[PDB]
Amino acid sequence: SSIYKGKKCRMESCFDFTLCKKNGFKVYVYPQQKGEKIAESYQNILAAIEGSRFYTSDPSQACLFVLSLDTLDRDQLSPQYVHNLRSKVQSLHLWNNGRNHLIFNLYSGTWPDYTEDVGFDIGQAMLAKASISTENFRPNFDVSIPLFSKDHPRTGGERGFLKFNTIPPLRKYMLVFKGKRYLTGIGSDTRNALYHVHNGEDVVLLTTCKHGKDWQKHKDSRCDRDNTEYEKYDYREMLHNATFCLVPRGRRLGSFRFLEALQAACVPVMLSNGWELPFSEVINWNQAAVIGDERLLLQIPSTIRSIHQDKILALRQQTQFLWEAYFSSVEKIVLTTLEIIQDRIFKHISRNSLIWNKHPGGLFVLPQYSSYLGDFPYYYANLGLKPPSKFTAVIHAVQPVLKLLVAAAKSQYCAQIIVLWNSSRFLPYDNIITDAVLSLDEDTVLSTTEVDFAFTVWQSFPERIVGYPARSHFWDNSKERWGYTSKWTNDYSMVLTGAAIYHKYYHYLYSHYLPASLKNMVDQLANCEDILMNFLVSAVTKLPPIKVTQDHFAQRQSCMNTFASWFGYMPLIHSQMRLDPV
């Protein structure tokens, strides 16, 4: 352990599992000194951390630490560089050689020979640097994170771009690029040889040497033609009309083009040799991207053409899923890094290689509930198991209930009935044996055959909520606020949990994923629990709920507005069908 206490730290040597106990893994954020300049992206990161359930205020309870100093940019010439950081980090009382400290970094190195120069001595602290070389990466200690701009959304999402999965997935162009080329320095070798493979019909590549003083000082015999060619095609049009997108190395291994390529759904073809792709040890990038070697730059287009059409479809879809699940917002990146760190504490309680690389993703799949894939509703088709044939009825009570209880018990799929006597309806219970939970209100009349039909419909769609009472949502232009519809419309986006069926895992997700503030507001207002439940289901599944057949109101709008503010977008999708028995 003491021998490998350097750049060779791993979690069995430069980490302390004792502080993480069993129900722990808390993250402590150092308080602000109120005397330092900090970039906006670092406020975004700490807002993500403190908004998460991993946040805590007591350093002793936490077994993970994150500094309050702006360490994202370590370039000396950058405006956001912080001076005298080496001596400043040693003045912290809780540093403890960075035993349980997580450092976020996006840039490192100066103009000559950009390297792993974080400035201050990290010591035992793992670093979540963006552009990490393969030889400089700790296999199971550090985390490779995406490089994002200051304009990257904090909590919301851009919902991708690919609205149509047209067949064939090929588009007007095949392999495109529009970026700066560098006359002198390090990292322009892959960029200066793109004209060798430029075609103009499918492989269209664009470069410019316009990067400051060297615009006309040391220009080669090709800047004139390059600049003339550069001023025709839009970057948001050629990126959105391309099957494949290049992400080559510039000054640094990473680039902003990667996230934009996942945004535009075009399959990235990385040329940055030896780059730990974001969450490479956790996410399979052979499934969402084409990894190419810059040494064989000339032979790339033949390999791109040789890729089969079905492979292109799969890569495009996986790229969209990865962007929309992990790279959409800074909050998603921060929580992904935190959960990746958490998965390495208990090796028997963590996510497998299939959860991360499949819907809905690791952020919505908590292994603390169970590490068994069949304990989740998302993986029945990937494995060979049918959905469970039995369901558990959960009834919350504050007579019709006497007749209601008998009707629900007569169902052939009913295993047991749980009656709740007093937002406590959503907590997990060890008494529930079945994986399907039927939440039934005391005032909702629900017939036995109706229960059976609802359960059979849920058996075909285990990931969703199958329920009878459905409510819709709308947008108000007068007040710029989201609205709640309780009237019969030819559209709907939410189903109430009063007479609905959903998987048992949603209880654990509600209890241990949503933060305390939303549930506290629900308790104080004494409503809005089912709306947030539907919000969580629509966020995890990205699908509308399924409806089957055969003063208080003003609080719902505020509930929806604050839930939208926390989520950052609409998990809700409007739905317009109604499944009925044949």
Binding site: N357, S460, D491, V582
Partner: protein, 585 residues
Amino acid sequence: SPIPERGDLSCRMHTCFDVYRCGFNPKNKIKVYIYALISREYNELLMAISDSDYYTDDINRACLFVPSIDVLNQNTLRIKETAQAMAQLSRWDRGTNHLLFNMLPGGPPDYNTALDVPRDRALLAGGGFSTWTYRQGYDVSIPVYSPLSAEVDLPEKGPGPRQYFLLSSQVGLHPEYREDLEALQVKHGESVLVLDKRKRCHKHQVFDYPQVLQEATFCVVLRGARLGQAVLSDVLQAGCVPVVIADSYILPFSEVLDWKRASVVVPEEKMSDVYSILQSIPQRQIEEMQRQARWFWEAYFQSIKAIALATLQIINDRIYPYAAISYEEWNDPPAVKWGSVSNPLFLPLIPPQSQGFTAIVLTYDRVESLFRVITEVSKVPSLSKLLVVWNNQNKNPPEDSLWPKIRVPLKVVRTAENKLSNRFFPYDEIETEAVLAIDDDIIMLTSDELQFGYEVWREFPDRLVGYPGRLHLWDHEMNKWKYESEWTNEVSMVLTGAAFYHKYFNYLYTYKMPGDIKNWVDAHMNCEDIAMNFLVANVTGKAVIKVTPRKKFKCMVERSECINKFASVFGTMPLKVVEHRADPV
């Protein structure tokens, strides 16, 4: 004799491997060379390499190099002699692309957890890897082979309850481990059994080593030597779920194999709490882990050939990630692989109404009824394009003047032959996703019905949506499937006539369906809809949506035979029975 430099741990694929040598080829397979001159194990390895598609001649064209030096065991390696041999190989080229095979990378006095030869840059496939001795993207973690896998043919016992819960059958445990094991045994009793010294002996009881592992639902593997013990292979062959207590050890083939669904890793410090956390794993997860353990043995640990093939496949996928094989093909058992679905349309995307559906009408010797349906189809909103396919060559298409006046771009395609499956060919004229296959005889549909069908398909772009309702039943008297349409309590199929489906289904029918079905269905001129339903349910693994509470739309033995043949060709029947239909809210 010259000796290369020591093992460079800062060696990765993008700086060490010479990608020029194996640049590109239509068959994305690495070519491996065998060096002319030894244990029987290495001889089996070399035979496995030479008898595979990776083996080639003409050394200057090959990509990988595997020297013919028995390096598998380091106990009798003669490190200096091995280094001198690799230097005298005369084709080392600083060891940029050479591959070495090992299973016991440890020394007598100290356990270096890696091959002790210089091996300055050679790619290493070893048995015992620590996280400090393992290069992530360069080295390959291979298992250590126990000859008991071939010496004894342990019966393939299925998953189920067992007499013992936890078992530890190893010889030579250090006292720090044996004391804790004894403490756990005396604490619980009758579930944990510890075996002491090819025969195992307990207190006044004797157990045969290969077969005793079958009676325990868990087996515990310690780190005693070289960090990798051959007991793991026996544990996996017997079916019991391994419990690796090694502190810093990466399980073999962890690059692609999901060891979390087959093994449990417990830190050596928390050895006294092994039983408590082992109670946490549920019984059905135990069954899955046993199945994964058996599959991992019957494919990667059974023989040296399996190990060599897996290692070469790892290197090939690293070199050619775009053509790399899937995760399921790596670590899915054949039974689950047959049961797996892997739906090609896996994004939960809802396309907007900006585009529409390309209606395809199949026509032959019926023109008076074709107008009555095309006029109604043209009235449907969000109809981007309409294609009329002309299967009849004897007749001439009617002149353009008499075609009905529509606001949708119409196109008539002249077929080369008269095949009823020509409606499912993916035409380049479809600029949309949804494709509406509508038949001539179908007249009793309103524009509202077609619009609602398209709207419902928007929510389910990955499956097939159709108006007519049919299903299938099992008859015990004939012991065969039958086609039933008179009564409808459940729905398992919808006819392609008046059906909304994604054009990838057309592509699948035209190209990826087995060739026995397309030709047969063309020859018999019937049951194209049944074949499309079968293919869609097989590829998507999802049900079918009927979007109308009506049965009559147009104004049995053959189809039963169609269903029976389609069930026979698939090896099972992919269709799923559901009783839910979609109607306006």
